[PDB]
């Protein structure tokens, strides 16, 4: 059996090829103790990873090894991978092929060092690096469609027609969760709540995951919040305090469609998806307008599919039939596709083996993976 896909900026998703869901998710977090040490027994470890780092977040300084799809701390990433193989999957990596993921248009050193650690520090018999958008299509079961994958660090579009990707039409915005979260905590200050870095950021992330949603009509929704209290909702902080959030719970995800809210000049995800189309061949656009596949956690906002349906119906010819595919398992679509891909008998030839790596070095990953 083969260990399977994850490189998530916000969450890890580990498991076994052929399973229907990851066996362990836990956040991609490494926390270091601060302002403690007096008691002989109140923590002996110098770092906590994923789960049980969220539990101890109060006394820790949490930081993500992966920022906008790019891993920026390889000492901590190795800790997370070590935690994944030994403390979550309870397996020995040196006897399981491991399939990893990566956002498109990432720095190539990212893949090169990913394959170096896998083959050297973990001695995996074989590995592979896949593109998250491609895997989402595997999970959906399609061979045609444009997949809008947005997780915690990157939102990107990969149009695929008949298993053929159009690399010139790949779009990538460094605007996903962890930017909506940062905007939400900024937007909560005007309501009277501070939520200073690290530990409180996770609280803000939880309130975003629970209360935030995408308004079908932002201007109409804004008027409703101003003129009434029906949209107000309350959330209980871990210490028992209750915060009331009103229009802030649909302005936070609105930055996906109006990135200028957070000072970004790029267009919204609806226009980026439409821009990804119209860079493909004209004969392919009809099938791409349908099969608009959503994936990733950041696409889990209620009403995001309907808003994207509405937004892409605009910008496009009236005769085109826009269809947004948002399966309930969006959040694990990438992992499910990786499980499907890694389990195919025909895929077993595509593995990069330890034999190839030592012959060609880390660069092999470029001429063996998309």
């Amino acid at each position: 059996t083969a260990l399977v896909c994850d490189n998530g900026s916000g969450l890890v998703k580990a498991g076994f090829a052929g399973d229907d869901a990851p066996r362990a998710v836990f956040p991609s977090i490494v926390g270091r103790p601060r302002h403690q040490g007096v008691m002989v027994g109140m923590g002996q470890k110098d770092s906590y990873v994923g789960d049980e780092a969220q539990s101890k977040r109060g006394i820790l300084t949490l930081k993500y090894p992966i920022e906008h799809g790019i891993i920026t701390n390889w000492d901590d990433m190795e800790k997370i991978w070590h935690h994944t193989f030994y403390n979550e999957l309870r397996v020995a990596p040196e006897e399981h092929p491991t399939l990893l993921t990566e956002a498109p248009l990432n720095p190539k050193a990212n893949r090169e060092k990913m394959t170096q650690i896998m083959f050297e520090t973990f001695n995996v018999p074989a590995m592979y690096v896949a593109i998250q958008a491609v895997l989402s299509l595997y999970a959906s079961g399609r061979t045609t469609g444009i997949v809008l994958d947005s997780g915690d660090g990157v939102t990107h579009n990969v149009p695929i027609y008949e298993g053929y990707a159009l690399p010139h039409a790949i779009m990538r915005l460094d605007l996903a969760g962890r930017d909506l979260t940062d905007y939400l905590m900024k937007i909560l200050t005007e309501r009277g709540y501070s939520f200073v870095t690290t530990a409180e950021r996770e609280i803000v992330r939880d309130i975003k995951e629970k209360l935030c949603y995408v308004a079908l009509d932002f201007e109409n929704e804004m008027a409703t919040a101003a003129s009434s209290s029906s949209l107000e909702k309350s959330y209980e902080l871990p210490d028992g305090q209750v915060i009331t959030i009103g229009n802030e719970r649909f302005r936070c995800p609105e930055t996906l469609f109006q990135p200028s809210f957070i000072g970004m000049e790029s267009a919204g995800i609806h226009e980026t998806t439409y821009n990804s189309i119209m860079k493909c061949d004209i004969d392919i656009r009809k099938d791409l307008y349908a099969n608009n596949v959503m994936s990733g956690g950041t696409t889990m906002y209620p009403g995001i599919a309907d808003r994207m349906q509405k937004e892409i119906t605009a910008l496009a010819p009236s005769t085109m039939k826009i269809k947004i595919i948002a399966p309930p398992e969006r959040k694990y679509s990438v992992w499910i596709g990786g499980s499907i891909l890694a389990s195919l008998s025909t895929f077993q030839q595509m593995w990069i083996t330890k034999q190839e790596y030592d012959e060609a070095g880390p660069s092999i990953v470029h001429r063996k993976c998309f």
Partner: protein, 156 residues
């Protein structure tokens, strides 16, 4: 009047200013918004030339891109009762706007201007040209008293 007039889809999206800029101290909401409408009304080249030439003259008069002409038209509209031809011309343009294939997006952009840049700040006393343009985009005319602003003081 303008039979077969056609417009380029999404031609006006680039003209919409950033939301942050709409909050600028010296932002000119009226001229910037009318710039969006002027771009939105730029006839598609598919339109027959005689119709294209006629309409371009109409929107040139009512939506000139020149500042001095826009100011002069605004002052000339303070006594719209004294310019029957101007009143009819604006009605004809207003008819074109309300039939625009993307009137919904233009109305959405107009409301964003109202909330962010205070386009409808004067409410009922809004200029004749701007008010009629908004009327075409928003038929009911509720924009005259529609900018509901949330208040943070003394709220539950």
């Amino acid at each position: 009047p303008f039979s077969g007039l056609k417009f380029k889809q999404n031609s006006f999206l680039s003209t919409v200013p950033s939301v942050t800029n709409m909050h600028s101290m010296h932002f000119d909401a009226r001229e910037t918004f009318l710039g969006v409408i002027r771009k939105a009304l730029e006839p598609d080249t598919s339109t027959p030339f005689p119709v294209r030439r006629a309409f371009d003259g109409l929107r040139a008069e009512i939506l000139p891109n020149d500042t001095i002409k826009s100011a002069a038209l605004k002052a000339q509209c303070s006594d719209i009762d004294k310019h029957p031809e101007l009143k009819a011309k604006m009605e004809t343009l207003k008819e074109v706007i309300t039939h625009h294939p993307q009137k919904e997006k233009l109305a959405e952009i107009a409301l964003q201007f109202a909330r962010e840049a205070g386009l409808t700040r004067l409410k009922g006393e809004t200029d004749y040209v701007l008010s009629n343009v908004l009327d075409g985009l928003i038929g009911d005319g509720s924009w005259r008293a529609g900018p509901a602003y949330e208040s943070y003081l003394n709220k539950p």
